[PDB]
Amino acid sequence: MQNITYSWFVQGMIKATTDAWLKGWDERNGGNLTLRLDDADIAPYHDNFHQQPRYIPLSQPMPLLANTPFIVTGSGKFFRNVQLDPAANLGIVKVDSDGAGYHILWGLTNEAVPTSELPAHFLSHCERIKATNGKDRVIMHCHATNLIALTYVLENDTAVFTRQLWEGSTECLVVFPDGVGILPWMVPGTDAIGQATAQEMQKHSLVLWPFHGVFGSGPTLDETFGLIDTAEKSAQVLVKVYSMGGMKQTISREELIALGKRFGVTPLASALAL
Amino acid sequence: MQNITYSWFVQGMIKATTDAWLKGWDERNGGNLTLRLDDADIAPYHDNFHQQPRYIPLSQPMPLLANTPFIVTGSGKFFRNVQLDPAANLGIVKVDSDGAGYHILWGLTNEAVPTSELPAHFLSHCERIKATNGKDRVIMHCHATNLIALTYVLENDTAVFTRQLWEGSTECLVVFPDGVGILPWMVPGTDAIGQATAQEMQKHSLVLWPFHGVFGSGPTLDETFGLIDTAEKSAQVLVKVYSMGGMKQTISREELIALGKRFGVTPLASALAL
Amino acid sequence: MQNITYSWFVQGMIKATTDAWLKGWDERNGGNLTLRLDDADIAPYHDNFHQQPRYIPLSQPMPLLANTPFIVTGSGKFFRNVQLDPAANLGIVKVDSDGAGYHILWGLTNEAVPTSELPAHFLSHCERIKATNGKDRVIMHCHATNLIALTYVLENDTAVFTRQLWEGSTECLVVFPDGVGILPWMVPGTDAIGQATAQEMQKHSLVLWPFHGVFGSGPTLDETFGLIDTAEKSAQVLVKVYSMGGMKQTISREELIALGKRFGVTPLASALAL
Amino acid sequence: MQNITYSWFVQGMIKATTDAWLKGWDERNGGNLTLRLDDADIAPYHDNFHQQPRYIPLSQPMPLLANTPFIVTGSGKFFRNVQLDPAANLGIVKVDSDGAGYHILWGLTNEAVPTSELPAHFLSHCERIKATNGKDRVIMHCHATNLIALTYVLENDTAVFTRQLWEGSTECLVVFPDGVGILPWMVPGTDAIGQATAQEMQKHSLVLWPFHGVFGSGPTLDETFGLIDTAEKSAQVLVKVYSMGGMKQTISREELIALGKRFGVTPLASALAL
Amino acid sequence: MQNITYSWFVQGMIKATTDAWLKGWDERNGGNLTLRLDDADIAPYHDNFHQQPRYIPLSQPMPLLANTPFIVTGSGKFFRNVQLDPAANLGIVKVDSDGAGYHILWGLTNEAVPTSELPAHFLSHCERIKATNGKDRVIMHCHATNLIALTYVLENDTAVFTRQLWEGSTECLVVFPDGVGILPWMVPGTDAIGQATAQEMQKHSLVLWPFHGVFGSGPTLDETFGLIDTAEKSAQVLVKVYSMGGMKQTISREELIALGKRFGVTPLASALAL
Amino acid sequence: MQNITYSWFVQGMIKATTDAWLKGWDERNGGNLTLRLDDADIAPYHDNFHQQPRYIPLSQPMPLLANTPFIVTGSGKFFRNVQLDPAANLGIVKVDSDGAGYHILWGLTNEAVPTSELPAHFLSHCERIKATNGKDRVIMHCHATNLIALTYVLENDTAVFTRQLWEGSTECLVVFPDGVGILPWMVPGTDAIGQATAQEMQKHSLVLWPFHGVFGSGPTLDETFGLIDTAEKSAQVLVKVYSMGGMKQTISREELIALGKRFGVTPLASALAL
Amino acid sequence: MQNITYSWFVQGMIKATTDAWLKGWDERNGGNLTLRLDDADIAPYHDNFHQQPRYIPLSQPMPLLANTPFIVTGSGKFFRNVQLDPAANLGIVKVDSDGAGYHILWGLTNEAVPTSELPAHFLSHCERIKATNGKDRVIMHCHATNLIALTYVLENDTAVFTRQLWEGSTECLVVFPDGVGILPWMVPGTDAIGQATAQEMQKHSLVLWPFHGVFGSGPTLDETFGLIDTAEKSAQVLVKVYSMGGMKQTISREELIALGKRFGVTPLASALAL
Numbered sequence A, B, C, D, E, F, G: 001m002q003n004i005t006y007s008w009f010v011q012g013m014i015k016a017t018t019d020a021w022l023k024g025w026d027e028r029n030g031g032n033l034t035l036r037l038d039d040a041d042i043a044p045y046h047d048n049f050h051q052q053p054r055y056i057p058l059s060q061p062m063p064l065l066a067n068t069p070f071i072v073t074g075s076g077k078f079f080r081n082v083q084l085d086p087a088a089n090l091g092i093v094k095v096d097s098d099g100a101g102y103h104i105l106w107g108l109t110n111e112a113v114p115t116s117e118l119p120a121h122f123l124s125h126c127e128r129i130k131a132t133n134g135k136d137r138v139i140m141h142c143h144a145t146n147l148i149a150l151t152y153v154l155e156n157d158t159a160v161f162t163r164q165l166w167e168g169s170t171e172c173l174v175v176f177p178d179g180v181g182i183l184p185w186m187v188p189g190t191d192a193i194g195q196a197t198a199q200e201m202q203k204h205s206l207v208l209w210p211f212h213g214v215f216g217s218g219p220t221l222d223e224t225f226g227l228i229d230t231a232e233k234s235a236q237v238l239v240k241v242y243s244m245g246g247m248k249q250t251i252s253r254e255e256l257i258a259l260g261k262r263f264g265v266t267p268l269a270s271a272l273a274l
């Protein structure tokens, strides 16, 4: 069989992390990415797996993810280095029969282990799975520059932040009509911040971590990266506007509503109501 | 036998200088990089060494560095060109038995010499070796754009500056808990500034040269580049924030303290006190 | 004999124009580059020359440039494409024995011609040849973004502007101690702007064209590009500083003097007595 | 971004050709090497590819190789020089959608073309792909000195030759249990010899060209070089033995059979029968 | 602490295998090397060990080697590749408290395991330890070219072979006065061939495996390599002599005896008696 | 302008003489090498030339070599040292306008002179220039080991020897279809041997000096070295074959003819009608 | 003051022993080298000398060597290791005021002593000093492979052996016209062999020790190594010839006489009247 590093998902992971690194969203080891795969995706590469896969317990039972394989970025790993050493920076893990832990089937060579925001990722995956009926398969976290900067000047309010981002680029309301969830600052790499994020994932495909980064969910690598890139693009436009003195004009609520009606999507009411 | 140009350290140097260039931190020949190697690293390449190495007396003798080899960037060399002609822009030097000078074993072709800031590097290498018990092996200087810009608007005070950078990105306190040392502006290339920088290196892994650049130390090329990139990323976020009118909210002291405990690290007290 | 496209000068031209494009200094067909070569440089490529070199009369004869060959960028050509087809975008021309005109020995295919500014370039090359005793060999014009932006906010005075750029990065005084000449806005492409620029070139290696771009001169492609890149980097830093409210501190007048002293260079006096 | 000259496959090619050169198996431009890559291998280096790849019609269409990339040695190129200028001596080619020809994406500078024996390589690649179910990726030809010398004193018979080589070193039967195919002398570079070699490749991983050289196939550069080196080592031992008067004792058939069972491998029956 | 790859023993292993590869004694994965270390040698590098060392049972109990650490070459590994990837090709193993098996403390990355002639090495180590009172610490196997060739024309007799080798170079009797043991051909990588070799190791520091290679033991890496190199050198001289028609004259028994007396060593009686 | 030592011709000279030394063809001061350059080659290195070029009168004037520059090996110089000090062992000479003598423009330090055979070389360069219409630029003499050995066992006849070498490696007829000229043994260093060699050069690119060495001519350093290396490789194969008892089979007379036909070359007729 | 490790003589010693190791002439610790220096040579490094030089009483006083300094190889040292640690393998010794003993001024660390044969060397140095009017300064002993092999097949007679070696390569008669002295086999390290060798040194610059090695003397390291290399090259050619059945043709007695006359040297008469 073909080498697993040449698979669609491994190549996709390389592409997403590499593009993110070039965007300037992932300095050092900042950010992480997890993709939910199907048994059939990895079945072809059984001969590539470690002969004695490492098992690592899971922070809290996640029955819904039992026997579910994921390709993930490693803890403390650089998005910049993914492209040339995939196995060292990426790993394929599989939650066991009862979601108690997982085995590292491939990659994460040299005692490496999955990302430290993993308990956060799995929790959000579970919620996005129910919220989107199994359609969302990607959870991506990165340090989107402008989005971060905005968390220091905009009221950390979901409705307020969502509305500004919708205003920052015409298609934002269409790309993320459910809005963006904003959590209060919280210590990272914790079951706690993972819980809260997962809770926001029930209501939004996008979640902001003030003074830190963004969390996005989507059906595919491109759609997810695209989701984040759209919000960051709006944020980038907003940063320039604010820096110039603020909005002289912008998209009106009636207009935002008309936009929603046209693309047959229903905008977060609270944000829409401003 | 493989050419030394294909060794891990030559490739590493190419990578670091190339990335910093693409970042826009090294216009013209600004910046420099020195990496401490082990004789075992260069032993395979005896055949690539200059038959009669050019000797270069070291201003201040550095016995601590005796018989130690380094790969360094050249004087008057462009980071942008390193990838194009490694031997012309890089050089491997070895400090003699009593650290009175060094021989250029490889590179630095057409009578080129090491970075003029080399002695300053050596001083800091010595202080970092003692401070980290020989773990640190890299000294990197570059003109990180936003970090530079901030030295014109923030109080050139170690505690204040460190506190703002910690605030600029959640990860900063964990990446550089020892904070950032800020020297007063000084004529570059002098023994004075090298002395003062080395002084600061005793307390910090990061040192700022107002209206000029940054100085970083770390165990590997990636960790040091990563260290600088993290600080520069925070600085970039701060520049946007300040440009928008300043912080409305930020990470709290108590939060910064919690962060410190969560990652088993002790934050520069003076910076926390703020 | 390798193809001329592989020659150091054709490759250097590609590198410079490409780097400039990647910098954002050469949108559309903005900018141009001319490099003075020696006959020995192009001698080995007689096989690559055009059988019937085309001839073009020089409006104003350049006697001091008699029999002098140059590699130049074409008129209407995009810096971005130079790398996609060197011969189509670049051309090697040789002024005849009496400086009456030149022959297009290579490149400039499809009947393309040198930059319509070749005559202005020639005028400055002359002034620089005299000013540097034949060391300067390059004239480069590009639309350096931040330098342009600053011409809308800073006094368009050689002394004031020079002072700011020196302050924007420690190395600037050392790189261009003669300062930067600032002409008043003028219609591009006129013998007047060419004459005025040439006049400024007698005193400065860098000349600014308000609301338009920069003009630089130097001994090699890297040095000239490096010169411009250094000024643009300082400008970039200044734009951020001004955007944040202005300098809280900067390099003192006395410090700049010390810097000059140390590197054995004499700074434009006017810039230090504002 | 790292230059493709530093990729694992370019370095691998440099290593193999350099080692064979040092072995004395590749005088002048004798010998050639082709390695089948995956699009994922060259995908990171899009920026190093020729803007408008030169297309080269393939004599015999090879649909099995459609859209497949290879790194190959050039025609008229010296193995000894590969390490000195990779781009000049090596080239990356990609077979078009229907295997009618290929485009040269990188290398083979100054209008150089792939080894003239390329079509022969492609034929064998096809037979080895089928024979090993896509495991083999390398086809290497060189003038192994002792193997050549033996073709003048040993009966040019597959069974006989294989038996002697197995006897020349204990490890041989385990390294090449399928034996060595011996073709009759044939004019090189012909479609005839490429056809016959490919034929033999269906049964053996090693093929001898009397009074000329050896042809080997394997999964990786090292395994193929290693395969050839093993046969050549045995041949070298045999040359010394014959030169001393011949074998007094040797490995027995029954012993060769035991060896075969011990390592779970089935020896070419005809060779064992002897 | 210092990285283990920079230790004396790791560097020694690299040197021995590399020199052996250059000698032409180790094609492909031919040959193996094991060195007995002391706890104190590796104690300094505890932090380099795998966090979960792999355990592998031992073919047969070896109590005498309980808690004994060794640095060994991996199975199927190339001597040629040791120099640039030590951890992948070398491994540090430690026999457990009762010599039942060992843990792979360092190296042998990527599911690699110790050499296949390991049960042979340990058995010979045990015998050489008692035979030399713990002074011998190295066991080296390689495919010494001429020694191999001679096993096909010389009577595979210890006394006979030993005598010819003594005759092949004056100092051979002084280097290996105990002679060379010659086993009958035997299937390799077996407990059997390991037993027989160990038995010969009781009487000799050198053991020949007809049509395969040599096995040597000594106090250090250099002394052992030197031992083998001396025998191979004599063998090389013998091959040329035989090829020229045989000995016209040689060292006499009286002379060999006098030689033994002078260097105060007692020559194998049987071999001496011829 | 880089130093001349880095020029392609000085580097080529180092490469050729070093490779030859590593081959065992140039013990002590055996052998010499001269390369005909073009003025454009050395023109760019006017700075590296000797202020007062030394002049040496040519016993016999070479009018056809007027104003022709060559890089040559020095008299009494060791090929092995060329790499340790190019200027000391190599020299660039230029014959004057009337071919009366030459000026030592570079190298040949400490009053060293060109090979005492420069005049013989010049004589052959002349004959080769005429024979190849100015393409051949190199004359190389070395002590090719096997070629020398064969002159003691094969008939020293151009046709017989040529036939054997063609047979020793398939490519030989194609590389040197004009065959190899064999002179009778003669005292080296005499105008007689130079005259006779030059005479053979009119017909062959390769000339043998029985019990001494080989003389080769070609367009570039690599081609000439390659030419010699090819003949020596065939010779090497022949030595082994003869040592084993002679050819049992070989390339037939008809096959050699076919080979010639295929590569569009006409083989020395005498060599095919023995 | 420069370091002695980079002195011409220390580097020369490294180069000679290293080249000899690469030649395969110095397996294990076989061979030795001593070079006679002038005080002017080592004087500049007095600062590197052992503060309290170790004295060594010499077997028998050698007034001719009074106050004479030598750089020598150590006892039991490997030629292969000299390049790795010069000070450990080499030593500079100076003969006292009355040739009674010497002081180890430099090197020979960790209690190492000069080659066990220093006195035999000294003995020959004396004879060569007288024989060549103080021109010879080097005594070198190594195990030249082919020369050794020939001592088993050629009559160990000075005249007969000398004639064959002269015949093996045209320049041998010119290089060593006084021929090669052949001693009968003798126990190495005895006063007798040293005496006998010295006696032969009065008449020859080259002495053979049957079934052991060669002994050479010359003015410089290169000339001496070159002398031995020339003889070994001839021997190498002879071994091939004899292996092919013997000389069919060779250099005639008359031709050898003409060669001698031509280069103004008088060949050992006995060798030319067999």
Ligand SMILES: [Zn+2]
Binding pocket: A030, A031, A141, A142, A143, A212, A213
């Ligand atoms: Zn994060």
Ligand SMILES: [Zn+2]
Binding pocket: B030, B031, B141, B142, B143, B212, B213
């Ligand atoms: Zn700087």
Ligand SMILES: [Zn+2]
Binding pocket: C030, C031, C141, C142, C143, C212, C213
């Ligand atoms: Zn413009």
Ligand SMILES: [Zn+2]
Binding pocket: D030, D031, D141, D142, D143, D212, D213
């Ligand atoms: Zn071939």
Ligand SMILES: [Zn+2]
Binding pocket: E030, E031, E141, E142, E143, E212, E213
């Ligand atoms: Zn083996």
Ligand SMILES: [Zn+2]
Binding pocket: F030, F031, F141, F142, F143, F212, F213
């Ligand atoms: Zn010669």
Ligand SMILES: [Zn+2]
Binding pocket: G030, G031, G141, G142, G143, G212, G213
């Ligand atoms: Zn000896």
